[PDB]
Design a protein around this motif. Sequence first.
Motif, PDB file in Angstrom:
ATOM      1  N   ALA A 102       0.834  -1.197   0.000  1.00 57.72           N
ATOM      2  CA  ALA A 102       0.000   0.000   0.000  1.00 57.72           C
ATOM      3  C   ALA A 102       0.874   1.256   0.000  1.00 57.72           C
ATOM      4  O   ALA A 102       0.588   2.199  -0.753  1.00 57.72           O
ATOM      5  CB  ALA A 102      -0.972  -0.003   1.185  1.00 57.72           C
ATOM      6  N   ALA A 142       3.974   6.840   9.938  1.00 56.44           N
ATOM      7  CA  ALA A 142       2.770   6.215   9.405  1.00 56.44           C
ATOM      8  C   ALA A 142       1.898   5.786  10.575  1.00 56.44           C
ATOM      9  O   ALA A 142       2.330   5.788  11.731  1.00 56.44           O
ATOM     10  CB  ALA A 142       3.102   5.020   8.506  1.00 56.44           C
ATOM     11  N   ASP A 143       0.658   5.419  10.259  1.00 54.85           N
ATOM     12  CA  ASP A 143      -0.308   4.942  11.250  1.00 54.85           C
ATOM     13  C   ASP A 143      -0.810   3.576  10.794  1.00 54.85           C
ATOM     14  O   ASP A 143      -1.609   3.480   9.856  1.00 54.85           O
ATOM     15  CB  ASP A 143      -1.457   5.930  11.426  1.00 54.85           C
ATOM     16  CG  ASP A 143      -1.010   7.235  12.055  1.00 54.85           C
ATOM     17  OD1 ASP A 143      -0.020   7.220  12.817  1.00 54.85           O
ATOM     18  OD2 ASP A 143      -1.648   8.275  11.792  1.00 54.85           O
ATOM     19  N   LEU A 144      -0.341   2.522  11.458  1.00 51.27           N
ATOM     20  CA  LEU A 144      -0.693   1.153  11.102  1.00 51.27           C
ATOM     21  C   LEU A 144      -1.953   0.741  11.852  1.00 51.27           C
ATOM     22  O   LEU A 144      -1.926   0.572  13.076  1.00 51.27           O
ATOM     23  CB  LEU A 144       0.460   0.206  11.425  1.00 51.27           C
ATOM     24  CG  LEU A 144       0.248  -1.269  11.082  1.00 51.27           C
ATOM     25  CD1 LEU A 144       0.111  -1.457   9.583  1.00 51.27           C
ATOM     26  CD2 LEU A 144       1.394  -2.101  11.626  1.00 51.27           C
ATOM     27  N   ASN A 145      -3.052   0.575  11.117  1.00 54.00           N
ATOM     28  CA  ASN A 145      -4.335   0.194  11.707  1.00 54.00           C
ATOM     29  C   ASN A 145      -4.316  -1.308  11.965  1.00 54.00           C
ATOM     30  O   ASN A 145      -4.452  -2.124  11.053  1.00 54.00           O
ATOM     31  CB  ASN A 145      -5.486   0.591  10.792  1.00 54.00           C
ATOM     32  CG  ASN A 145      -6.836   0.543  11.489  1.00 54.00           C
ATOM     33  OD1 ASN A 145      -7.032  -0.210  12.442  1.00 54.00           O
ATOM     34  ND2 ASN A 145      -7.772   1.355  11.012  1.00 54.00           N
ATOM     35  N   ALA A 146      -4.141  -1.677  13.231  1.00 59.17           N
ATOM     36  CA  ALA A 146      -4.131  -3.078  13.618  1.00 59.17           C
ATOM     37  C   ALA A 146      -5.492  -3.494  14.161  1.00 59.17           C
ATOM     38  O   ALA A 146      -6.367  -2.655  14.395  1.00 59.17           O
ATOM     39  CB  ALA A 146      -3.050  -3.337  14.669  1.00 59.17           C
ATOM     40  N   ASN A 201       2.791  -9.535   7.148  1.00 59.93           N
ATOM     41  CA  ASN A 201       1.413  -9.653   6.681  1.00 59.93           C
ATOM     42  C   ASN A 201       1.316 -10.605   5.497  1.00 59.93           C
ATOM     43  O   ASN A 201       0.373 -11.400   5.405  1.00 59.93           O
ATOM     44  CB  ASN A 201       0.861  -8.279   6.304  1.00 59.93           C
ATOM     45  CG  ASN A 201       0.796  -7.333   7.484  1.00 59.93           C
ATOM     46  OD1 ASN A 201       1.136  -6.156   7.372  1.00 59.93           O
ATOM     47  ND2 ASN A 201       0.358  -7.846   8.625  1.00 59.93           N
TER      48      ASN A 201
END
Lengths: 89, 89, 130, 130
Positions: free
Chosen positions: C66, C96-100, C121
């Motif tokens: 992405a 960055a902001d990693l949506n877990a 991933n």
Amino acid sequence: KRFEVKKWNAVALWAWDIVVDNCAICRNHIMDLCIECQANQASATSEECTVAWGVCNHAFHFHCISRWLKTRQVCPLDNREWEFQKYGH
Amino acid sequence: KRFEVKKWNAVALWAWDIVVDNCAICRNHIMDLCIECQANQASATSEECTVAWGVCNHAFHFHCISRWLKTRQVCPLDNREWEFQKYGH
Amino acid sequence: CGCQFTSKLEGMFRDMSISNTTMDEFRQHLQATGVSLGGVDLTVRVLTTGYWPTQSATPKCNIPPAPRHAFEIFRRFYLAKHSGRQLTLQHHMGSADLNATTRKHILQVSTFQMTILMLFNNREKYTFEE
Amino acid sequence: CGCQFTSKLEGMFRDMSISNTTMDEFRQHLQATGVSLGGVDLTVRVLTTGYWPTQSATPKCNIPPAPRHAFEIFRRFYLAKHSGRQLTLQHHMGSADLNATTRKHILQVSTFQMTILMLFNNREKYTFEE
Ligand SMILES: [Zn+2]
Ligand SMILES: [Zn+2]
Ligand SMILES: [Zn+2]
Ligand SMILES: [Zn+2]
Ligand SMILES: [Zn+2]
Ligand SMILES: [Zn+2]
């Protein structure tokens, strides 16, 4: 394949900040008439209240830029002196 | 998936017509020394013959740009006064 | 001290505010385009090398899918309307902001753990060799 | 007649030569990028509506994969500058060279038969309903 395109010669037209759907002088719409004429009719004289097109591809109601030429004369969306070339749409 | 990226905030650096691999003043290379130095050494005083970086983000040899600044400082590529802001590479 | 380094200081600050205007401009340009689900939320800035020096080496590590699509879109946009500007690839800057995902807690990665987490991933149970 | 319409005349001619320079500019941009494969030999002219009237209605019919990808690339490029404002969707102008294939005779289509011939290439034996 049987037919393959090799060359193309499109001509691409362009529009500045005409904002198709709003006038930058009176803020009403690309249609819906202007602030001076208010309603679609309201004595619009056989709908003579039309859109004006400048050389810098800027589109206002004929009326709203006409009246802007009694005070200023240099198109409010850049600096160009502004001409009265194309009309309607 | 288990981890999905939502936001990103890269910072993208940019280079004008520095042409990484050639100098626009003497045409030799980003390295390979200049026309005033020819060979890599040839008395380069401990390799002091380095690359100069302008504010206009242009990059030519120190000796070459020194001669250009000695005359008119307008940058051979664009039209900037050229400052000794960054250096080396 | 006087006006001798304060000039480069104005240089940096100008870079900053101008890249903020460039962020709003790219938001507009990605609203017209941005068809890929890779440009969900993008915050790309534009600085000059004449004021901002290289951190260590400006490496060329693999980017993540992405972020790969986001960087590709940004480079395509920059390699067009800009005045001969060359979008550079660097990992040693940004975040960055990693949506877990029991709740959905969003993590944070400073452009360093994005590639390793993306490889995890794609396939878990990796090591240093992988 | 005098200098009253000859002004719009200079307008048109300027549009022309400037779009020729724009064609050389886009050639270098396609050498730097050119993502869409459909966008090959392109003579895109950037003219102003302030001089060139709309032919009949400015249509937006199905664009053909090669000229479709081509139109998408052109619109993305034209919007990379004017955020949002992309290449105007029209088909009532221009031409093309259709390379057919005993020898390889190249045909010509004036932006009108491209879509029908592309639909024939995708699947022959069509009619007016198709
Ligand atoms: Zn108005
Ligand atoms: Zn009116
Ligand atoms: Zn204007
Ligand atoms: Zn040199
Ligand atoms: Zn030298
Ligand atoms: Zn320069």
